[PDB]
């Protein structure tokens, strides 16, 4: 027959992988503002996310207004560090 008590630990192992998958996807989704996350982000994507924030306030915020709001021309972030150049 089929020894199913032998299979129960495999079901536990598979289900733990399911919890990590579901949990990671959920917490990232909430972190990005009820939005799917970004992955494999290069320097171009990183810069585009900073530009989105200086338009909306959120690194994931979107807007399609063809005109920038006032003060956008002053809020471009120049990053400051002490040591490692």
């Amino acid at each position: 027959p089929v020894p199913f008590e032998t299979l129960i630990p495999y079901g536990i192992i598979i289900a733990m992988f399911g919890v990590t998958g579901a949990g990671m996807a959920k917490v990232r989704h909430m972190f990005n503002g009820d939005k799917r996350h970004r992955w494999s982000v290069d320097q171009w994507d990183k810069q585009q996310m900073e530009r989105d924030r200086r338009l909306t306030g959120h690194l994931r915020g979107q807007t399609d207004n063809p005109i920038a709001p006032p003060g956008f021309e002053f809020n471009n972030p120049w990053k400051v560090x002490x040591x490692x150049x």
């Binding site: 290069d42 171009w44 900073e50 972030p77 120049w78 400051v80 560090x81 040591x83 490692x84």
Partner: protein, 190 residues
């Protein structure tokens, strides 16, 4: 009357703390000192491995991930295993390797002052920018044309490593070849 220059903390996209560079630097010197004052050569190599790790972690935190991981894989993972192998097999009495370090103390002091004073003046302003009120700050911005398709450091090396500078690669292969044949010829029975 307004404050045209504005400074504020960065919330996300923050970046690591430069404090961690200070802890790693003192861990390297402590482990380095422990290398040359340890009684047992095996324990000396353990402190040396520790020194490799701190330098390797240092390189990773400043963004030199590929080279930093290469140190872990190659120096810790291969070179120092070979060192531990031979040391842990050969017969060693610690009494035979321990000299009176006190007789070396004045020469130690003199050599340190002479060598450091000359070698420090040779360092370009980049490496001495942040070591020993009016603190200077590095500022960075973005480009778009430069960032069209960024390479990771390992890809930038790979772009030139086999084509522009491949003479170095050939030369290194010959050294590896010679090392393989040489170490075998002097150690094994034919």
């Amino acid at each position: 009357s307004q404050i045209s220059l504005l400074l504020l903390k960065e919330i996300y996209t923050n970046g690591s703390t430069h404090i961690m560079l200070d802890i790693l630097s003192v861990l390297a010197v402590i482990s380095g000192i422990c290398v040359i004052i340890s009684k047992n050569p095996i324990v000396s190599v353990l402190h040396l491995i520790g020194l490799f790790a701190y330098v390797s972690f240092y390189l990773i935190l400043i963004g030199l991930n590929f080279v930093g991981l290469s140190y872990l894989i190659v120096y810790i993972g291969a070179v120092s295993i070979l060192f531990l192998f031979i040391l842990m097999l050969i017969n060693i009495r610690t009494s035979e390797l321990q000299s009176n370090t006190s007789n070396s103390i004045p020469l130690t002091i003199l050599v340190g002052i002479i060598i450091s004073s000359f070698l420090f003046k040779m360092l370009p302003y980049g490496v001495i920018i942040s070591n020993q009120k009016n603190d200077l700050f590095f500022i960075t911005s973005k480009i778009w044309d430069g960032a069209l398709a960024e390479n990771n450091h390992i890809s930038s090396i790979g772009n030139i490593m086999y084509t522009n500078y491949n003479v170095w690669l050939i030369l290194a292969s010959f050294i590896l070849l010679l090392a393989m044949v040489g170490a075998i010829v002097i150690t094994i029975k034919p």
